[PDB]
Design a protein around this ligand. Structure first.
Ligand SMILES: Nc1ncnc2c1ncn2[C@@H]1O[C@H](COP(=O)(O)OP(=O)(O)O)[C@@H](O)[C@H]1O
Ligand SMILES: Nc1ncnc2c1ncn2[C@@H]1O[C@H](COP(=O)(O)OP(=O)(O)O)[C@@H](O)[C@H]1O
Ligand SMILES: Nc1ncnc2c1ncn2[C@@H]1O[C@H](COP(=O)(O)OP(=O)(O)O)[C@@H](O)[C@H]1O
Ligand SMILES: [Mg+2]
Ligand SMILES: [Mg+2]
Ligand SMILES: [Mg+2]
Lengths: 371, 57, 57, 371, 371
């Protein structure tokens, strides 16, 4: 038999079998409902479009994300998404395939308990398991030591690992992520005269952010150059026309990751939370964590983030310390690669939460030694 | 002018009567929670006295 | 006819805010007594918790 | 120095000297041109009628609004409007009167830049300033905290203020306003047999909306009452006769503010945007914002809007907190009163943008330390 | 003349005059700066809120503690705190009043030297003195032997004293204190779905910790009881409604004092450090030390901490030995009472550090015979 590795994430579901080099099912975790009347009869219209199908009909649907920040806030939509993933994207029966799921640290217990209950009751999987999204990224990188930053779409967090031993007291979790960057881009695009309010325009703004935004090495210098020169202007082609031009907003949007005060958030930038998490650890393992800084997640693909963060950390770290950042090109899918690797081990086969164990011990077995 | 005044008075009548009914179930809720609080306080006091006697002995 | 209706409506108004202010005062007093009831109930609860710990020790 | 105060707003222009509690000139922001040929020779009609005279000649002209939702779309009409306000209405020389201009939140910066350029280069005002509508409205209410809802004719926005400190990340802007309500009133009156198509009938439908519309505390119960009884029907006098009877359309038109799905909008009603804006703020200031909900703007003058909004917010807010909505009789002119109060302050004298400073700093002076 | 007895502590500044029975002014030691910009002009907010005033504006201010673990890190903030204490809370001019400062054992000499320099220069006090926070606590208990445990908010030290002769070699200092407990409560409240991240919410979490938390006699038995029963769950009302119920997280927060491994600390628990310090002393004075365990400080105010500590130390101590723990109702203010008693003594009048002596002997005079 083979195991399935499902990475719900927040807004982009990636799933596939265990023992592959890449997922074969990547689509947004969105559910759409028709908000208009519908005059044609005999059309046989469906009441809910889930997955990449809803992206094709964004002009007649309202789109809802079942996951706000890691926590699932809508369980019927999550059930629909899982059913679609298991029966149409992967086209496999879950009655004979163990499933491996991922979730962020510092996650409410109710979310995990109900996820396991849904997996065991509705789909009736024979076994399942839940793992942190940072240990998997460490697995994919081929390392065994080093602080890992996993900035996805819902939650950004750092988890330090030394020699395969985690340090739970040094874990820092932040809710600033790609969705907040999209909202800030929406807020600042009205400065030039472009208004995007409907959830259909959310995907347009997200595409603009993915295609044009980049992180500047220096903020003040680029502001001085943009205010005087005009070489930073870049045009984008809307789904119909009236192409838009973006100036300093191109690099102003991703600055929130380093200056959270832009969106009114009290917390400090990621370049400082990483340093705080490093100093939260011991004193005899800080060298390896400095020299094994690992990046992952979709949000960490802005052009120039791996240089700005290195400069900031070198400014914060002692002068006699060397700082290295590992940013593989496959940052977005690193978690799934690590999950597939972990599920491929024969040693891991004894860590599955069997159906008999769940029946004996209730939904609370998940928080026991069988993590 | 008289019709406008009458309409405004009727609107105020409806609004304040709705507020009055809201107040009525507010009385009901307050009464039931007051009764329950008094009952639990009395029970706590009597079991307090029993525990105090056990403590003395 | 409209003037008669408006006079009746305004008399109904004056009397309904009369009951409105009476009900306002009633809510005020019952809400206060709710506060004292809640405070005495929680005090009794914590007192019994303390003496139960004392009894077991 | 008897500084001048103006409020361009949307659909109405109101202006007057500082230190007063009432605008001296209020007239619609309408510019009209003749559309017929004219046969009488010697009278010499002018090529454009601006302001109140266009309403007198409404039956021969084509009325145009130079601003759609806050943003100016026809500038030449705006110089015409400002010239009319400064000369025909106030009879003042703007060469020695500082001018305070009121502008909506979340607008293109080119708008403010062009306003300042027009003021300084065309009328040659010694100094000027641009302020936010909501802050002035909160000045006029004699408060220092509380979320304020300013629904005019162009745009509806909520700005939360606590102890004089704004919360920009919680400022929400919605383009639903009185003009959309008038358009929906036409679209819903066309089903009774009354067709209003020309721009002159825009004014008649607006007058009907102002005179005969109210917000119902409940919708389904009110619909049931109107569908059986005929006590809700009222008659209106058109400027030539043929009385028209309006039934349930009198309270169906303002329901768009609470059910914006009527006109195809995706957003939520004002009763929900206000609650969301309150919830975006900090947890230690939500009590004062809940207890100091301030209303302003002409659109908020519907009989019964305050009670409905209070009921909806109480349904949304926790049951253990009091909800108070402040609706003074003078909601429409609150912004101008706040502007006059602000301009009369002596600590404001050093916050003017002087002519020399503007000449030194260019049109981009608006967004600098001087606001 | 009259003398002033101050107690900087960590997070709570309490001060008064010598000879009084209780401190006259008690307020948190925080400094707040407005993190927003401020739209209302003319009000002129101050740029720094100090003391209990900053508690009233938690929603527009960021709170910083000038003392982290006993030592002062920010000196301008501490100077502001002292100025506020001397000029507003007490309204007494300090140019003619000797001051009695307190500090924790095992602190850097630079802290004490800079404290003396600031007191002698900025405020020009006629005389000053620095005393150990444990000797004063022993004074306030009417004792002359027995160890004392001053577990405050920043530091937790255990100073043994026999017959008025201190034993410097048996003094044990531990940095686990109330602030770490509050941070751990923050960390474990996310387990239930409540996220408290802002510095303003630190005060709220501290309030829940003070009100609801208690120390369990047996950790495992209470774990079994809470898992099965539901009588341990109590609800707390947030400053904006939405009451929250905390169950198992009630006695987990103060367990860190006895199980330091919860927050990643390696050191042993308070009960074990007390026993180790008892056996660190001689063998002929262990009986009085066992029979005179004195508790003080704000952190020792948990319901049932004394019983658990007595049980643990009796388990550690020989069976034929008597153990008594002294926990007066006024543990929190014991240090100030002892300081007032010490300053009121007639023999103490010859131990003040005179201004002439300071000018003659430099800042290093404090470490000399004049302690
Ligand atoms: N090249 C890019 N530049 C900027 N942002 C990107 C880029 N690629 C992806 N993103 C952002 O990353 C998000 C996807 O994150 P993802 O890796 O799916 O997190 P998770 O797997 O936890 O859901 C998208 O919402 C998108 O906004
Ligand atoms: N008594 C009323 N009842 C209902 N609507 C009104 C009333 N008075 C004014 N309005 C609406 O308010 C609008 C005027 O808004 P206004 O206060 O002039 O905005 P601004 O001041 O920003 O120009 C008009 O379009 C009208 O439809
Ligand atoms: N009843 C209580 N229960 C639990 N903790 C308390 C209680 N009262 C005070 N505290 C804690 O004690 C701390 C105050 O300690 P304090 O004696 O002021 O230290 P210092 O003497 O160093 O200023 C506060 O931070 C608070 O969290
Ligand atoms: Mg992820
Ligand atoms: Mg307006
Ligand atoms: Mg202390």
């Amino acid at each position: 038999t083979t195991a399935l590795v499902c990475d719900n994430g927040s807004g982009l579901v990636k799933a596939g079998f265990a023992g592959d080099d890449a997922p074969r099912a990547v689509f947004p975790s969105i559910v759409g409902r028709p908000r208009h009347q519908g005059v044609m009869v005999g059309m046989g219209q469906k009441d809910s479009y889930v997955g990449d199908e809803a992206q094709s009909k964004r002009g007649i649907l309202t789109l809802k994300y079942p996951i706000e920040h890691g926590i699932i806030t809508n369980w019927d939509d999550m059930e629909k998404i899982w059913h679609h993933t298991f029966y149409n994207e992967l086209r496999v029966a879950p009655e004979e395939h163990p499933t491996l799921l991922t979730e962020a640290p510092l996650n409410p217990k109710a979310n995990r308990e109900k996820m396991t209950q849904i997996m065991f009751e509705t789909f009736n999987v024979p076994a399942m398991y839940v793992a942190i999204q940072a240990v998997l990224s460490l697995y994919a990188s081929g390392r065994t030591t080093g602080i890992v930053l996993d900035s996805g779409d819902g939650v950004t967090h750092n988890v330090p690992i030394y020699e395969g031993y985690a340090l739970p007291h040094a874990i820092m979790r932040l809710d600033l992520a790609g969705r907040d960057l999209t909202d800030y881009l929406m807020k600042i695009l009205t400065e030039r005269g472009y208004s995007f309010v409907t959830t259909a325009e959310r995907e347009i703004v997200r595409d603009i952010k993915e295609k044009l935004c980049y992180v500047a090495l220096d903020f003040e210098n680029e502001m001085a150059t943009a205010a005087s020169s005009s070489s930073l202007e870049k045009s984008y082609e809307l789904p119909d026309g009236q192409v838009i031009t973006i100036g300093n907003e191109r690099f102003r949007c991703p600055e929130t990751l380093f200056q959270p005060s832009f969106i009114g958030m009290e917390s400090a930038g990621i370049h400082e939370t990483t340093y705080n998490s490093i100093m939260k650890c011991d004193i005899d393992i800080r060298k390896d964590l400095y020299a094994n800084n690992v990046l992952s997640g979709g949000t960490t693909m802005y052009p120039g983030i791996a240089d700005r963060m290195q400069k900031e950390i070198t400014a914060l770290a002692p002068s006699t310390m060397k700082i290295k950042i590992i940013a593989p090109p496959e940052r977005k899918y690193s978690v799934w690669i690590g999950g597939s690797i972990l599920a491929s081990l024969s040693t891991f086969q004894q860590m599955w939460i069997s159906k008999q164990e769940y029946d004996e011990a209730g939904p609370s077995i998940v928080h026991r030694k069988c993590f | 002018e008289a019709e406008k005044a009458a309409d405004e008075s009727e609107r105020g009548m409806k609004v304040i009567e709705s507020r009055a009914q809201k107040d009525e179930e507010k009385m009901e809720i307050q009464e039931i929670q007051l009764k329950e609080a008094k009952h639990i306080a009395e029970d706590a006091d009597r079991k307090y006295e029993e525990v105090a006697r056990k403590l003395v002995i």
